[PDB]
Ligand SMILES: Cc1cc2nc3c(=O)[nH]c(=O)nc-3n(C[C@H](O)[C@H](O)[C@H](O)COP(=O)(O)OP(=O)(O)OC[C@H]3O[C@@H](n4cnc5c(N)ncnc54)[C@H](O)[C@@H]3O)c2cc1C
Ligand SMILES: Cc1cc2nc3c(=O)[nH]c(=O)nc-3n(C[C@H](O)[C@H](O)[C@H](O)COP(=O)(O)OP(=O)(O)OC[C@H]3O[C@@H](n4cnc5c(N)ncnc54)[C@H](O)[C@@H]3O)c2cc1C
Ligand SMILES: Nc1ccc(C(=O)O)cc1
């Protein structure tokens with residue numbers, strides 16, 4: 038077969054890039070290793086920046102989001118006896134964030150693609166990239182037991198952290214920066230009403246807790262746990278008792294608990310690779326960088342990479358300005374690093390770290406007291422949270 | 429002898445407290461271990477907050493400062509190829525800082541005290557504090573070979589990091605928080621014109637450098653050095669070559685070098701003790717807390733402790749409200765911790781740390797890029813730098 042842009046991975050990055058390209062007349066083929074419902078089983082993200090919201094509207098897939106997504110104007114941080122609200126809308130100059138599940142976003146894009154007629158090959162096994170530096174790169178995969186070859190101009194690696202794309206660039210060409218945190222997030226999805234109309238991030242002596250939601254009758258909760266814990270040790274009862282123990286007395290008593298629909302432990306990590314391209318291969322989303330969940334940047338960074346990649350490919354295809362594609366990494370890395378910094382800061386001020394001396398505990402508490410009590414401090418949290426502008 | 433308030437230490441904290449008290453009619457006696465010129469030989473501080481400036485005016489010793497001190501409206505930070513100015517005056521809401529040497533401040537207070545006739549015992553050896561919890565505490569010291577006893581109501585320990593005051597409080601009553609940095613500052617004082625009309629803080633791959641001044645024909649420079657260096661290894665030539673190597677090409681070429689009047693290495697440290705009092709003993713300045721030089725808070729924090737102590741003693745003496753003195757530590761610790769946080773942040777973003785991984789280097793660079801490029805970020809640096817309000 039033959040196409041213009043081959044896309045590896047049908048997660049939100051790939052589907053979003055694919056929809057944008059298709060709408061603009063640039064033919065693309067998506068290759069996914071798993072099945073549609075496997076992809077649709079991943080819970081993940083819940084908070085989206087306004088830029089991603091506008092990107093979905095531009096990809097023409099915002100009907101359901103516009104109807105079901107919730108617009109939040111503030112977030113709360115609870116620490117050592119108090120609860121503080123950050124009015125994002127006034128502190129950021131009128132910007133907000135939208136709560137709409139990643140499963141939903143993926144679902145909406147899958148429907149949109151399924152309808153357009155654009156090619157998508159699920160269960161594409163053994164994907165391999167070839168001739169990344171020639172004028173005609175190609176991808177080979179196995180459908181059942183037949184290995185097919187797909188010819189293209191460019192390849193977008195949107196295959197997540199464990200994808201084949203990043204592995205296909207000569208190790209010597211990339212420079213990796215990584216930080217692994219000594220803890221993970223145990224999340225729990227329940228069909229219960231959320232405890233607040235806005236999220237609650239809480240720093241507690243027992244560790245971090247987060248009160249989120251998916252809708253008015255569906256909540257998503259998290260608690261910081263050691264990397265040595267296995268989800269089978271955490272019953273529903275245990276989770277609720279623990280969550281309650283870490284929240285303000287008045288919040289815990291309003292909490293409506295219930296059986297879990299999903300429970301899992303996600304480990305925290307920071308990861309950036311430089312550069313994000315190689316020949317005719319460009320990496321996007323989790324294939325190029327990972328941020329700890331704390332700042333809600335992962336999917337949002339994937340969206341800005343995709344936005345940049347899409348717009349540079351548009352110029353190359355319709356305007357014949359293929360030289361602009363060399364600028365991909367420079368543009369993306371600027372936003373990536375700023376987002377990585379915010380995610381790291383949030384992670385360090387809200388979590389309980391092992392083997393922390395009295396001094397560093399005091400500095401962690403004061404960081405919160407200063408940023409949450411200063412007009413200039415609240416503003417730095419706010420603009421970063423709502424999302425820094427796309428360049 | 430007998431007095432109302434006995435003051436241990438004739439550094440700026442003690443002399444300032446002493447002058448304020450004297451002016452208000454509260455008799456005080458200062459006890460200094462060294463000689464007047466020993467105290468006057470310490471170079472130290474150069475930057476003063478507006479609050480300290482107003483405290484000096486209130487102590488009635490601001491003539492020379494008002495004439496010789498320099499008012500700075502901005503500071504510069506140079507990092508990885510660039511130089512950025514922080515306009516403190518507009519970003520802080522009209523506030524500024526004054527450059528007037530600590531030697532000068534001390535000199536002016538010594539003259540003021542010498543003139544008023546208030547008691548000061550230099551070369552008071554073997555100072556010991558007694559009955560800190562009774563109604564009548566007393567201090568004993570040796571003048572020559574005679575041990576005298578001084579009776580008082582309260583004792584202000586303004587004796588610096590190595591004073592006898594802090595050591596006199598039962599170890600079990602105090603909680604210490606300390607952080608020692610793996611480097612020191614090698615400073616050099618020269619009778620040369622400063623390289624800029626405003627300070628330049630520089631982060632360089634070889635380490636930190638700082639371009640300060642004392643007047644238009646006197647400069648003070650610093651460079652970060654390992655704790656293993658001895659000043660005898662650092663000749664004048666070597667210092668200048670090193671300083672030059674760490675500054676922007678355009679700044680280094682304007683530099684007017686010259687022989688040093690003073691050269692010394694100060695090690696960096698963070699130190700706070702809780703509480704700051706015990707019975708009739710109250711600690712102030714370096715006796716209670718130490719901050720790394722980077723944020724220029726040391727002397728400024730000593731000034732706010734003294735301001736609080738003075739005003740609570742006024743109420744106790746003239747208004748008979750001695751119960752208010754129990755609030756000393758609570759009031760002071762609030763400002764202390766905020767200042768400690770700022771000093772720690774400045775120290776970590778401007779210095780080169782040993783055994784730093786690629787990720788943390790990248791985060792350090794991005795912290796600068798974000799705070800120096802954001803209106804909200806610049807403001808957090810500015811208000812903290814000019815000084816947070818006295819409570
Ligand atoms: C607990 C948690 C909470 C989070 N919270 C938020 C939030 O509130 N907001 C936010 O912005 N971010 C959040 N994130 C992150 C977000 O989930 C990810 O950044 C986002 O999924 C990345 O999308 P992606 O398309 O790059 O990759 P993925 O979702 O990983 O999809 C990549 C696709 O690649 C396919 N693939 C893999 N290998 C191959 C191969 N060899 N060939 C073919 N296909 C292959 C995979 O099967 C997968 O379908 C959170 C993440 C977690 C884990
Ligand atoms: C390199 C450097 C740069 C700095 N830069 C700045 C700046 O720009 N701005 C700023 O705010 N801060 C700065 N600081 C800090 C500032 O110098 C100190 O915080 C300030 O000196 C503390 O004043 P103090 O009165 O509490 O103590 P000190 O200056 O230490 O004086 C204490 C007095 O106690 C006396 N004493 C000690 N033991 C006894 C005893 N047993 N009995 C009697 N007397 C005794 C001592 O001899 C001394 O005279 C800097 C410090 C250094 C070292
Ligand atoms: N920071 C985060 C905020 C919200 C969620 C979520 O709703 O899943 C996850 C992370």
Ligand SMILES: Nc1ccc(C(=O)O)cc1
Nearest residue numbers: 473474640721722723724
């Ligand atoms: N942060 C600092 C600023 C200035 C000086 C000084 O002038 O000595 C010292 C420290």
